[PDB]
Swiss-Prot record, chains A, B:
The chain holds residues 992 to 1021 of 1366 of the full protein. This is Collagen alpha-2(I) chain. Forms the fibrils of tendon, ligaments and bones. In bones the fibrils are mineralized with calcium hydroxyapatite. It is linked to Ehlers-Danlos syndrome, arthrochalasia type, 2: A form of Ehlers-Danlos syndrome, a connective tissue disorder characterized by hyperextensible skin, atrophic cutaneous scars due to tissue fragility and joint hyperlaxity. EDSARTH2 is an autosomal dominant condition characterized by frequent congenital hip dislocation and extreme joint laxity with recurrent joint subluxations and minimal skin involvement. Osteogenesis imperfecta 1: An autosomal dominant form of osteogenesis imperfecta, a disorder of bone formation characterized by bone low bone mass, bone fragility and susceptibility to fractures after minimal trauma. Disease severity ranges from very mild forms without fractures to intrauterine fractures and perinatal lethality. Extraskeletal manifestations, which affect a variable number of patients, are dentinogenesis imperfecta, hearing loss, and blue sclerae. OI1 is a non-deforming form with normal height or mild short stature, and no dentinogenesis imperfecta. Trimers of one alpha 2(I) and two alpha 1(I) chains. Interacts (via C-terminus) with TMEM131 (via PapD-L domain); the interaction is direct and is involved in assembly and TRAPPIII ER-to-Golgi transport complex-dependent secretion of collagen. The lineage of its organism: Eukaryota, Metazoa, Chordata, Craniata, Vertebrata. It comes from Homo sapiens (Human).
UniProtKB/Swiss-Prot annotation, chain C:
Residues 14-28 have a biased composition (Basic and acidic residues). It comes from the Eukaryota. It is found in: Secreted, Extracellular space, Extracellular matrix. The gene is COL1A1. Changing R14C: Found in a patient with isolated osteopenia and vascular rupture; uncertain significance. Trimers of one alpha 2(I) and two alpha 1(I) chains. Interacts with MRC2. Interacts with TRAM2. Interacts with MFAP4 in a Ca (2+)-dependent manner. It comes from Homo sapiens. Transmembrane segments: none annotated. Contains mostly 4-hydroxyproline. Proline residues at the third position of the tripeptide repeating unit (G-X-Y) are hydroxylated in some or all of the chains. Contains 3-hydroxyproline at a few sites. This modification occurs on the first proline residue in the sequence motif Gly-Pro-Hyp, where Hyp is 4-hydroxyproline. Forms the fibrils of tendon, ligaments and bones. In bones the fibrils are mineralized with calcium hydroxyapatite. Glycans are attached at K29. It is linked to Caffey disease: An autosomal dominant disorder characterized by an infantile episode of massive subperiosteal new bone formation that typically involves the diaphyses of the long bones, mandible, and clavicles. The involved bones may also appear inflamed, with painful swelling and systemic fever often accompanying the illness. The bone changes usually begin before 5 months of age and resolve before 2 years of age. The C-terminal propeptide, also known as COLFI domain, have crucial roles in tissue growth and repair by controlling both the intracellular assembly of procollagen molecules and the extracellular assembly of collagen fibrils. It binds a calcium ion which is essential for its function. This is Collagen alpha-1(I) chain.
Amino acid sequence: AVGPRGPSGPQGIRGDKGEPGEKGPRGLPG
Amino acid sequence: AVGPRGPSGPQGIRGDKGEPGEKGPRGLPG
Amino acid sequence: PVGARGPAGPQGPRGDKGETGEQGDRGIKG
């Protein structure tokens, strides 16, 4: 008889941190 | 007559990339 | 016979949300 199926592998690695948001809009006139 | 347990599985897929950050704050007044 | 190889591990964890964008340009002067 064939042996039992092996256990689950290890969990995957963490995904990359998201990208930074874009630069904010320009300030109001003085 | 039985065979031995199988090998552990491969590592799971990599996690999702994080979503982009919010847009920055508005620039300071002139 | 040796058992089958195990299934893949779970998907890895999600990356953090990206950082907020930098502040915008200073406004034109008064």
